[PDB]
Design a protein around this ligand. Structure first.
Ligand SMILES: *[C@@H]1O[C@H](CO)[C@@H](O[C@@H]2O[C@H](CO)[C@@H](O[C@H]3O[C@H](CO)[C@@H](O)[C@H](O)[C@@H]3O)[C@H](O)[C@H]2NC(C)=O)[C@H](O)[C@H]1NC(C)=O
Ligand SMILES: *[C@@H]1O[C@H](CO)[C@@H](OC2O[C@H](CO)[C@@H](O)[C@H](O)[C@H]2NC(C)=O)[C@H](O)[C@H]1NC(C)=O
Ligand SMILES: *[C@@H]1O[C@H](CO)[C@@H](OC2O[C@H](CO)[C@@H](O)[C@H](O)[C@H]2NC(C)=O)[C@H](O)[C@H]1NC(C)=O
Ligand SMILES: *[C@@H]1O[C@H](CO)[C@@H](O[C@@H]2O[C@H](CO)[C@@H](O)[C@H](O)[C@H]2NC(C)=O)[C@H](O)[C@H]1NC(C)=O
Ligand SMILES: *[C@@H]1O[C@H](CO)[C@@H](O[C@@H]2O[C@H](CO)[C@@H](O)[C@H](O)[C@H]2NC(C)=O)[C@H](O)[C@H]1NC(C)=O
Ligand SMILES: *[C@@H]1O[C@H](CO)[C@@H](O[C@@H]2O[C@H](CO)[C@@H](O)[C@H](O)[C@H]2NC(C)=O)[C@H](O)[C@H]1NC(C)=O
Ligand SMILES: *[C@@H]1O[C@H](CO)[C@@H](O[C@@H]2O[C@H](CO)[C@@H](O)[C@H](O)[C@H]2NC(C)=O)[C@H](O)[C@H]1NC(C)=O
Ligand SMILES: *[C@@H]1O[C@H](CO)[C@@H](O[C@H]2O[C@H](CO)[C@@H](O)[C@H](O)[C@H]2NC(C)=O)[C@H](O)[C@H]1NC(C)=O
Ligand SMILES: *[C@@H]1O[C@H](CO)[C@@H](O)[C@H](O)[C@H]1NC(C)=O
Ligand SMILES: *[C@@H]1O[C@H](CO)[C@@H](O)[C@H](O)[C@H]1NC(C)=O
Ligand SMILES: *[C@@H]1O[C@H](CO)[C@@H](O)[C@H](O)[C@H]1NC(C)=O
Ligand SMILES: *[C@@H]1O[C@H](CO)[C@@H](O)[C@H](O)[C@H]1NC(C)=O
Ligand SMILES: *[C@@H]1O[C@H](CO)[C@@H](O)[C@H](O)[C@H]1NC(C)=O
Ligand SMILES: *[C@@H]1O[C@H](CO)[C@@H](O)[C@H](O)[C@H]1NC(C)=O
Ligand SMILES: *[C@@H]1O[C@H](CO)[C@@H](O)[C@H](O)[C@H]1NC(C)=O
Ligand SMILES: *[C@@H]1O[C@H](CO)[C@@H](O)[C@H](O)[C@H]1NC(C)=O
Ligand SMILES: OC[C@H]1O[C@H](O)[C@@H](O)[C@@H](O)[C@@H]1O
Lengths: 125, 447, 105, 52, 48
């Protein structure tokens, strides 16, 4: 079935790098884009960027310019997301979305989503 | 009184359809019969009989055309078929013991390895030169024991040099029963009606040249530069730009290579770059500076029409994540280059000292993205010098921003097929329906 | 710029309710075809209605949206006891603040 | 076939793959096939009555 | 080690991407795809 699995992450300390995954199945993985979105607890959504797994061409917003890196391993149809030099306001939940099925041909909007992983940070233990 | 029906044969009526098309070349003689088949094609007419039309209106769509998919399929099928009877490099992936080139503190390395011979029991030892982008270590802890890059995942075949990769004009000519309509508007923004429509037997020459981030040897515009796209107000569609005056660009590899042929089996041969004689230097590419700044000024002045009459326009280098759509990739003289293009989109716009660019060279390429195939490239002897007319541009809009007037622009390699969309945006195939009914008075004598 | 929407609106069971929001019309122009998402409490959001005047498969059409001359609206006809979730409006890249639709126990 | 096999892939050359059964985890038992008895006898009676 | 059988575990040499390396591997084979070669009388099997 068309779906996306993720891997839950533990709380990280400030100044560390997180590792986010997103694994798809079913439909062909090298045909459509894939976006990354974040949701803060008690606020609205905010878009992070979009990666094209066909050729590795990425494009992300200016809010995270120079701090996030997106890769892809099409040999096993999995994505990745790295982020170092963290802060305290980056406590949120992350999602990876696609546009596998829609009558229109434009890239937006995306409909299918995944489980999602809530990442939060703590200064001390 | 009442009326009757009449049937007409030969009435001009068309309908938007699609079908296949065949090759069409011009009479030319030559080290021939390159990958693009020429002997198995139709010699074109000496002069095309372009016919003009009046008072005719119809629609177009450059982002939904069907000729580009057929052209891509034909190109990939022909490239695959012209590599079947060529040599296969299976026993080349023996482990290597490769040393540094004794230049004190490097681009290439000399590797020595065992190789078979025509006699199944003899084993010879040969040395060659390999570039740094076609070798991956295997030990890492920490000695030098190297191996190739592709035969961990896929196989490899050689490109025996009796054929050439030089692009040649190719006319797409529709079969008997169909027709082609060409629009001749000087303000064709991409989609909509076109007043001046003509009917030609079939199109002119097309050079199927592969390029990324920068079109090459295309078709010049007229009186203005063109800025085309499908939807500008969203960051999910690459934007095409076409200049009105070609910019000259000179790429050169000053090395002096030597072809060294060794036996790999009964009736086969294996070529390598045996030695570099001369001065070890990096292959570069030059572009004029004043013309580039003038062209950038023209294109930003033309682009200001779509983003308010007073905004800040900035350029930035590629985002990254590959070796094919971050740099400027092309082929010439029988070699594939990868020239960094960061020294071009490094300006900021508001309200004779030429530019230079470094270039790297690869041999084991994985072009035409697939699995199970990898094409080796034979080395060219002598020196290479390629002059080109850069005319096009491919730019992704930007990322998401809160609010400002300082949106940026970053070039990114397209889908390896938009290079032809700068040449097939003024063509459309159509069929003929010579039947029809019309009411008028008739009484056919039964007699 | 960005899209805004009221934080919360009241609603009674059975009664048909409405939600309408739109920023400055110079960015909208009436043709961006803003979509509408449903964000469930502690769950994965899902699409309720895509670009405009059209409903995707798998979702009931008992509540649907429309686009007026200057504002996109969403009419929930026949409110039931399963509409306890947030509603978001989304353009190509821009998003809204958020709306909450509450029911009476 | 009530067994629980495992696919094990190994390399055989550049760009090739070779699959094999893995070490089975479970209960080693024989693959079988069941057929109803009364229906079979009824069908055999019908066919012999027709063949007579 | 099922004491007193349908399948048997076999081990053999196999090549690799590198033409000089040789890696031994084991697998499971059914009793109808294997025929002995010695018969006098040790266990040395081959395919059919
Ligand atoms: C864009 O079009 C250019 C044509 O002006 C083309 O340049 C030509 O490329 C060939 C390829 O090696 C060069 O060499 C050719 O011509 C010499 C003439 O002596 C022959 O000996 C060679 O065998 C070969 O046919 C040309 O010198 C060069 N220039 C001209 C004027 O022909 C570019 O290569 C094209 N760009 C790309 C990316 O292919
Ligand atoms: C590359 O190196 C070649 C070998 O030295 C050189 O070849 C020859 O040219 C020189 C200069 O005129 C002659 O003296 C010599 O007899 C030639 N030998 C052969 C076998 O052709 C090439 O000229 C060098 N490449 C360039 C571009 O100069
Ligand atoms: C065959 O053996 C599999 C390995 O134990 C087993 O797989 C899994 O299922 C169990 C039961 O729910 C899970 O606890 C375990 O995490 C699963 N692991 C994987 C890798 O999927 C299969 O269920 C067995 N086959 C049958 C039919 O039960
Ligand atoms: C790479 O190594 C090979 C072998 O070590 C070099 O080949 C020989 O080069 C040396 C120069 O140091 C000569 O003295 C020998 O006569 C050459 N032949 C043999 C059979 O040893 C090769 O030159 C090296 N590559 C480079 C670029 O220096
Ligand atoms: C690219 O190469 C061409 C060919 O040599 C250069 O063109 C010429 O310019 C030089 C000096 O600028 C003149 O001596 C030649 O007479 C010119 N020839 C032609 C045919 O125009 C061109 O300048 C080179 N590009 C750059 C940026 O230097
Ligand atoms: C073959 O399998 C089918 C499917 O399980 C069996 O059918 C059913 O019979 C069992 C018990 O006899 C019932 O609990 C199921 O509800 C039945 N399902 C259906 C769809 O009929 C069938 O009995 C099996 N064959 C034999 C000979 O046992
Ligand atoms: C067939 O033989 C192989 C090798 O003897 C077995 O593989 C190993 O199995 C033993 C179990 O006795 C383990 O202790 C080892 O760790 C396994 N690996 C190696 C590398 O020896 C295999 O299990 C046998 N097949 C069956 C069905 O028992
Ligand atoms: C694009 O241009 C920027 C401009 O600097 C390059 O920037 C940086 O990254 C380098 C290595 O990753 C660092 O050594 C520089 O200090 C750093 N500079 C800044 C201002 O951040 C970037 O590498 C270029 N990208 C590519 C793909 O060439
Ligand atoms: C085209 O239309 C114009 C205006 O109706 C008319 O004057 C002209 O004769 C037409 N052309 C032809 C070839 O009939
Ligand atoms: C070979 O070149 C590498 C590249 O930096 C260097 O690290 C290494 O020390 C060199 N070794 C010798 C023997 O020259
Ligand atoms: C094959 O047999 C011959 C017999 O003289 C022997 O010399 C040779 O070594 C054998 N094969 C090889 C290549 O060793
Ligand atoms: C060939 O292989 C042997 C051992 O595998 C090695 O000693 C020898 O150096 C190799 N040949 C060359 C030319 O390196
Ligand atoms: C081209 O012009 C038509 C006419 O209004 C317009 O609908 C379309 O959006 C334009 N497209 C571009 C890419 O400018
Ligand atoms: C880009 O322009 C700035 C302007 O000062 C310069 O410092 C920088 O070196 C340029 N980048 C490259 C890669 O030339
Ligand atoms: C490049 O432009 C020049 C100047 O217009 C022209 O003479 C030349 O023919 C062009 N190159 C090609 C390959 O058409
Ligand atoms: C490979 O062959 C050698 C001798 O030919 C043998 O000793 C070895 O056991 C074989 N490998 C395995 C895994 O059995
Ligand atoms: O002569 C070597 C080389 O020179 C140049 C072109 O004519 C090529 O076709 C040819 O192969």
């Amino acid at each position: 079935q068309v779906q996306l699995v993720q891997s839950g992450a533990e709380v990280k300390k400030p100044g560390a790098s997180v590792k986010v995954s997103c694994k798809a199945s079913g439909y062909t993985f090298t045909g459509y884009y894939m976006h990354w979105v974040r949701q803060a607890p008690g606020q609205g959504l905010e878009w992070m960027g979009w990666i094209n797994p066909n050729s590795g061409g990425t494009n992300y917003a200016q809010k995270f310019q120079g701090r996030v890196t997106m890769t892809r391993d099409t040999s096993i149809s999995t994505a990745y997301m790295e982020l170092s030099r963290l802060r305290s306001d980056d406590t949120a939940v992350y999602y990876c979305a696609t546009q596998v099925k829609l009558d229109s041909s434009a890239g937006y909007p995306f409909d299918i989503w995944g489980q999602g992983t809530m990442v939060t940070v703590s200064s001390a233990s | 009184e009442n009326l009757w029906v009449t049937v007409y044969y030969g009435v001009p009526v068309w309908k938007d359809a699609e079908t296949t098309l065949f090759c069409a070349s011009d009479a030319k003689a030559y080290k021939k019969h390159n990958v693009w088949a020429t002997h198995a094609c139709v010699p074109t007419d000496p002069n095309p009989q372009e016919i003009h039309l009046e008072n005719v209106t119809e629609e177009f769509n450059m982002w939904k055309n069907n000729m580009v998919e057929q052209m891509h399929t034909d190109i990939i099928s022909l490239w695959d078929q012209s590599l079947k009877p060529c040599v296969k490099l299976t026993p080349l992936c023996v482990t290597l013991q490769c040393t540094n080139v004794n230049i004190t503190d490097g681009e290439l390395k000399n590797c020595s390895f065992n190789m078979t011979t025509e006699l199944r029991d003899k084993r010879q030892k040969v040395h060659a030169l390999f570039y740094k982008l076609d070798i991956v270590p295997i030990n890492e802890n920490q000695n030098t024991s190297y191996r190739l890059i592709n035969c961990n995942t896929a196989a490899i075949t050689q490109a025996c040099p009796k054929v050439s990769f030089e692009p040649i004009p190719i006319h797409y000519c529709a079969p008997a029963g169909f027709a082609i309509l060409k629009c001749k508007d000087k303000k064709f923004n991409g989609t909509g009606p076109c007043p001046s429509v003509s009917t030609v037997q079939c199109t002119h020459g097309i050079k199927p040249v592969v390029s990324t981030q920068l079109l090459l040897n295309g078709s010049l515009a007229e009186e203005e530069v063109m800025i085309r796209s499908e939807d500008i107000r969203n960051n999910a569609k690459n934007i095409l730009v076409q200049f009105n005056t070609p910019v000259q660009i000179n790429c050169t590899r000053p090395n002096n290579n030597t072809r060294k042929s060794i036996r790999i089996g009964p009736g086969q041969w294996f070529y390598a770059t045996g030695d570099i004689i001369g001065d070890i230097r990096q292959a570069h590419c030059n572009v004029s500076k004043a013309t580039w700044n003038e062209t950038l000024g023209k294109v930003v002045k033309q682009l200001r029409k779509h983003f308010g009459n007073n905004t800040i326009i900035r350029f930035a280098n590629s985002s990254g994540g590959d070796l094919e759509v971050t740099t400027h990739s092309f082929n010439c003289g029988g070699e594939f280059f990868y020239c960094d293009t960061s020294g071009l989109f490094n300006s900021t716009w508001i309200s004779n000292d030429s530019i230079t660019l470094p270039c790297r060279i690869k041999q084991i390429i994985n072009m035409w993205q697939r699995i199970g195939q990898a094409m080796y490239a034979p080395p060219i002897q002598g020196v290479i010098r390629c002059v080109s007319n850069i005319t096009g541009l491919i730019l992704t809009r930007d990322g998401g921003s809160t609010d400002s007037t300082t949106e940026t622009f970053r070039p990114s390699g397209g889908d390896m097929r938009d290079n032809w969309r700068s040449e097939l945006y003024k063509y459309k195939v159509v069929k003929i329906e010579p039947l029809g009914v019309a009411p008028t008075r008739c009484k056919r004598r039964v007699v | 710029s960005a899209l805004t929407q009221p934080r919360s609106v009241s609603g009674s069971p059975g009664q048909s309710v409405t939600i309408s929001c739109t920023g400055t019309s110079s960015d909208v122009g009436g043709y961006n075809y803003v979509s509408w998402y449903q964000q469930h409490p502690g769950k994965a959001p899902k699409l309720m209605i895509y670009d405009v005047s059209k409903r995707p498969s798998g979702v009931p059409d008992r509540f649907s949206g429309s686009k007026s001359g200057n504002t996109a609206s969403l009419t929930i006809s026949g409110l039931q006891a399963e509409d306890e979730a947030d509603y978001y409006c989304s353009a190509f890249e821009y998003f809204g603040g958020g709306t909450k639709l509450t029911v009476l126990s």
